[PDB]
Structures are given as C-alpha cells and as structure tokens.
C-alpha cells in the first residue's frame, strides 16, 4: 500500500514537471491538419457511441458530418496535448486554436 | 467493517461524459458492491468520496472540469479514480 | 479491431535478454522425451512433440 | 438515435440488395448473420435494432 503511494506520487510529480504552463506555450496558435483530422475522427467516434451532442442535426446521419458541424461552431469538448521531443507537453482546447 | 482508500484505473464511455462520476459509479463501482474482492480483501459494502485524478497536473483539486485521456483506437476514456471502500472482511 | 472493446493497458517498451535455463524449466508445462510425434491410430503420444500439455491438437482438449 | 432510419432499411434490404446489411453485432458480441434469413425475419431483427440492452455489463453499448 505504501510502495504504490510512493510510485503514484513519483509519477504524478514527474508528469507535473512535464506540463508546460498555459502562459509559456510557444507552439503555433493555429490547428494543424493532423490535429483537425484526429479531432474530427475522435469526436465522430464518440458521437457514434451515444455521446451527448452540442449541435443541431439538420437531418444528418453521418457522425463525421456531426463532428464537422460541431467543429465549425467550436463546440467540441476536446483538448490537444501537443508533445515536445523531451516529453514535456502543452494543452490546447479546440476553442483556443484557430482553424486554417 | 473497514474503510480502505483505493485508486483504480477505470474506463469511461461516451454516454457518461457529462456525468463522469455517476458513469464511474454505474460502470465499475456499483458492480463491485456486495461481492468479495481479492484485491481489497473482503466483502465490499459501499464506496464514498469518489474523485477523478485530472490528466492535466496544473489544474486545482477544486476545478469542476477535468481532463480524461481518450484511447487512441476507441472513444473510451481512461482515468485514475480514488475512492474509500467500506468493506466487511471476515 | 472493435471500437466497443477498449483495452486498458498498453505496451510502452520492450527489452531483450537471454532466457535462462532455470526459468524455462519452471514455465514449461511438459518436456518431450520420445522422438515419435504420434502413435498408431493417429493419436498424439503423450510425452512427444504433440502433447496435450502443449496445446489442443486436432479436436483434442488441451491438457493444460 | 439518428441512425435507425437508414440502418433499419439496410437490415431489411438484406445482404444482396444494395444498400444493405450483412451482419448484426449485439452488445454481448453475438454476430447474427443476415445471409440465410428471410425478409420477415429481417423485419423482426430490424425492429429490434435500437432496443435498450437488458444486461448491465453492456448497458453502455449499442448494436452495430
């Protein structure tokens, strides 16, 4: 019980060091093509599994189209964790990024 | 009767995204009650104080919104959750 | 792949090493001594290469 | 909930009428094949597409 707590504290502290604070991220403010593609794919996969939908489906049956509709209106509840080669990372919500 | 604080790595479906705590309860914790558990040591009778460990470390512990890591292949999320189990171990 | 069957674990790294003689003697379910694979009537002979402790073989339940 | 309009018709159309359906995967993983089935059985199966699961273990899952 005590070894696991030490392991958990060590892992959480090592992760906390990796996380770049919100006011120090120096990556591009735009959303890359790969980031947009995977956002759409993951959101569509979620919607396909009865995830709550934050947009009006104008008679649409394609989950990917629902994801694109939500991305147009910036209502996707996802976060991109951009990884630097060192292992340190930055967190950007989809709202903060600007498409194209 | 003993209270044991545990941390479990559990999954979360898309249907429980707006209520992740109730999703963890209805998925992994409710089936765990009234059944002897070998990794605890007795008959789990209840759980209390369920909390989700946030994926971003810089958030507070009082933040209402947290981050859950989505599986690369599936839409399921996975996260660590701490909870105190009330268990009768004979 | 089935998106409704999530996997909770993940392989992060692998490392290479020699398989010591002590461990294989422990993990093994049976050792082979007779260099005849299957006897008459097509049945796999116990202790041979095709042993029911090495896995199910041709509609025979694995002994392990 | 948004899909049953098309998926029901796909199940009815069967495996040999495009657009159609060739298999149904229940929540538990059962793979009901639509190949050797009549139209009436296909309508019975299609009317039971969006039926909520009776099992707690798969209550987060839907058919495919």
């Amino acid at each position: 019980p005590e070894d696991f707590q030490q392991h958990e504290q060590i892992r959480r502290k090592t992760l906390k060091e990796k996380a770049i604070p919100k006011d120090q991220r120096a990556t591009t403010p735009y959303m890359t093509k790969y980031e947009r593609a995977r956002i759409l794919g993951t959101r569509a996969l979620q919607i396909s599994m009865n995830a709550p939908v934050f947009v009006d489906l104008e008679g649409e049956t394609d989950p990917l189209r629902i994801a694109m509709k939500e991305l147009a209106e910036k209502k996707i509840p996802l976060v991109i964790r951009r990884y630097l080669p060192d292992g340190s990372f930055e967190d950007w919500s989809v709202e903060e990024l600007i498409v194209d | 009767i003993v209270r044991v604080p545990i941390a479990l790595y559990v999954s979360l479906a898309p249907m429980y995204l707006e209520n992740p705590l109730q999703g963890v309860m209805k998925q992994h914790l409710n089936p765990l009650v009234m059944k002897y558990n070998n990794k605890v040591g007795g008959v789990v009778l209840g759980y209390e104080g369920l909390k989700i460990l946030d994926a971003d470390p810089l958030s507070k512990e009082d933040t209402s919104e947290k981050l859950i890591k989505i599986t690369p292949d599936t839409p399921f999320g996975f996260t660590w959750c701490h909870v105190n189990l009330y268990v009768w171990q004979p | 792949m089935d998106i409704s069957k999530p996997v909770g674990s993940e392989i992060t790294s692998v490392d290479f090493g020699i398989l010591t003689a002590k461990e294989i003697r422990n993990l093994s379910a049976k050792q082979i001594t007779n260099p005849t694979v299957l006897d008459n009537l097509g049945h796999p002979v116990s202790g041979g290469l095709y042993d029911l402790a090495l896995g199910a073989f041709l509609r025979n339940l694995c002994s392990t | 909930a948004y899909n049953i309009a098309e998926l029901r018709q796909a199940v009815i159309n069967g495996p040999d009428k495009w657009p159609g359906a060739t298999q149904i995967q229940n929540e538990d993983g059962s793979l009901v094949s639509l190949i050797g089935m009549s139209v009436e059985q296909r309508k019975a199966l299609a009317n039971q597409l969006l039926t909520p699961s009776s099992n707690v273990s798969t209550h987060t899952l839907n058919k495919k």
């Binding site: 019980p1 | 044991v4 545990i6 990794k39 605890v40 040591g41 171990q89 | 909770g8 | 273990s57």
Partner: peptide, 18 residues
C-alpha cells in the same frame, strides 16, 4: 463479464485498512 467496461483495469490500495 470481466470486461474493461465492467471491472477496473488496475486497483491498488492507497493506505492501510482503517
């Protein structure tokens, strides 16, 4: 039964029983 949608992937004890 015994699925990642039912049982925890890993369960560890944090503190000693109390």
């Amino acid at each position: 039964t015994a699925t990642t949608l039912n049982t925890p992937v890993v369960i560890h004890a944090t503190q000693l029983p109390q």
